[PDB]
């Protein structure tokens, strides 16, 4: 790596998709953003102002500042033995809202909902904790249709 | 002249720790010195090297500093020191200093006999 310019090794990263070359859909400029929202950063090749760096591509941050045209987002970049909060200003074309905590927001709502539903009917409270798969129960399986399977012979040569 | 019963006295190593290569050279004295060479076989404690001084070899606290008789040792130079230092202990025994002259060592032995204090070097300068 003799040369290290702002856009080096960006042949594939800052290049548009097979049938996605063109002008940003107007939704990018119509999406409301609020401070503390999680936003994924993915560069758009067509737009060359407010472009973040290739490191920032694939990073998720919170919006510290909302500004007339670019939103300031703060990511955590591991520099050697310390993670540093890198505040960057990125134009709308390269900032996309992140589902990120969307699962947690759904869980908080569902856990509260299944608490009230119980207070009314089905009074025993439901388990609102995730269980990581767990072992299978004993069960019973019919072996009436069981088919014998045998190793097949070699035929390649 | 007989001490408290006490327990078995275990000496972890009977022989003294000798400095590495003290045997080859007279200039190197046998007094233990820690090996600090970049490539010292004794620092690396290879197989067959001489044993290294470590706190693990330390004697039991109960039997540390104890003479083979079973009494610890107190160094006496004058009759006042025997009376003050050996104030009714059954744990420690007396030992007159090398400097104390024969004449004084008779009056140090006599007071000791009256006080029933064991003197380890009783037969010293005796003529």
């Amino acid at each position: 790596t003799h040369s290290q310019g702002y856009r080096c090794k960006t042949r594939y990263c800052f290049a548009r998709k097979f049938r996605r070359h063109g002008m940003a859909n107007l939704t990018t400029y119509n999406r409301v953003y609020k401070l503390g929202q999680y936003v994924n950063i993915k560069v758009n090749g067509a737009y060359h102002k407010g472009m973040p760096h290739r490191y920032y591509n694939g990073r998720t941050g919170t919006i510290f500042n909302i500004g007339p045209r670019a939103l300031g987002v703060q990511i955590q970049k591991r520099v050697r033995g310390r993670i540093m909060l890198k505040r960057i200003n990125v134009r709308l074309e390269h900032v996309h809202p992140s589902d990120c905590r969307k699962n947690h927001l759904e869980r908080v709502a569902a856990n509260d909902a299944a608490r009230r539903l119980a207070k009314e009917t089905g009074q025993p409270v439901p388990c609102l904790k995730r269980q990581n798969a767990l072992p299978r129960a004993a069960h019973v399986v019919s072996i009436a249709s069981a088919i014998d399977i045998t190793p097949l012979k070699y035929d390649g040569v | 002249i007989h001490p408290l019963p006490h327990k078995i006295i275990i000496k972890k190593r009977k022989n003294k720790f000798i400095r590495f290569q003290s045997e080859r050279f007279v200039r190197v004295k046998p007094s233990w010195r820690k090996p600090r060479g970049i490539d010292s076989p004794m620092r690396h404690q290879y197989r067959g090297q001489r044993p290294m001084v470590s706190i693990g070899y330390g004697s039991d606290k109960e039997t540390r500093f104890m003479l083979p008789c079973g009494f610890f040792k107190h160094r006496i130079s004058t009759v006042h020191e025997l009376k003050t230092l050996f104030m009714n202990n059954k744990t420690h025994a007396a030992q007159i200093a090398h400097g104390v002259s024969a004449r004084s060592r008779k009056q140090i032995l006599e007071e000791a006999k009256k006080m029933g204090v064991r003197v380890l070097n009783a037969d010293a300068k005796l003529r």
């Binding site: 798969a133 767990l134 072992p135 129960a137 004993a138 019919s142 072996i143 009436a144 | -």
Partner: protein
């Protein structure tokens, strides 16, 4: 008054134990009978009775602390396996079982029998009270730290560990990781399936740990 409370409490734990030891013994005997009857019913119907999947594994570290990979070391420290020949009980969930497969080369695991659990809890069991290794010689120490979880006596302890019950985490953490004698180990390099010793030994863990206790 404290001695009077201690005498009163000791009797309550002894009473709970004289009852639980008998209640739990029926549960273990019934479990063997229930699987046998379910199997008999299934074979008459041309069906097969699958038994229930194991809910607890006995993991024994069989490799040394030299040259351990960073992920391997981290996972082993969370299993509490910090020295060779150490043994711990772990729950069976995707989170534990995926981590255990990463460290398979360093460990041997299997479903433990109730007698294997009893022998480890009684002969080699030591508590973790105040971050100290306190030997479990009486039902009083277990009562003191596990009465909140209803694990008053040793029979409650060998039952919670075996059934992987609600108070399994508390029960397991109360036990300092077991320190065992050196394993026989036919081959430390290969998996028990390839004929070595590492990885899943299944029911054979009971035999493997037997000598080590």
């Amino acid at each position: 008054e404290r001695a009077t409370e201690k005498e009163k409490r000791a009797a309550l734990v002894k009473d709970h134990a004289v009852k639980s030891a008998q209640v739990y013994a029926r549960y273990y005997i019934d479990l063997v009978e229930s699987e046998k009857k379910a199997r008999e019913n299934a074979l008459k119907n041309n069906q097969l009775y699958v038994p229930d999947e194991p809910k607890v594994y006995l993991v024994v570290r069989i490799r040394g602390i030299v040259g351990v990979a960073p992920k391997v070391r981290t996972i082993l420290s969370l299993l509490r396996l910090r020295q060779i020949n150490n043994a711990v009980f772990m729950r069976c969930n995707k989170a534990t079982l995926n981590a255990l497969r990463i460290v398979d080369h360093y460990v041997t695991y299997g479903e433990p029998t109730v007698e294997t659990i009893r022998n480890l809890i009684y002969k080699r069991g030591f508590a973790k009270v105040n971050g100290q290794r306190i030997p479990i010689v009486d039902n009083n120490l277990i009562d003191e730290q596990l009465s909140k979880h209803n694990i008053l006596c040793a029979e409650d302890l060998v039952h919670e560990i075996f059934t992987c019950g609600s108070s399994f985490k508390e029960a397991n953490n109360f036990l300092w990781p077991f320190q065992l004698n050196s394993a026989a180990l036919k081959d430390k390099r290969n998996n028990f399936a390839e004929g070595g010793d590492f990885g899943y030994r299944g029911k054979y863990i009971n035999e493997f740990v037997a000598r080590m206790i």
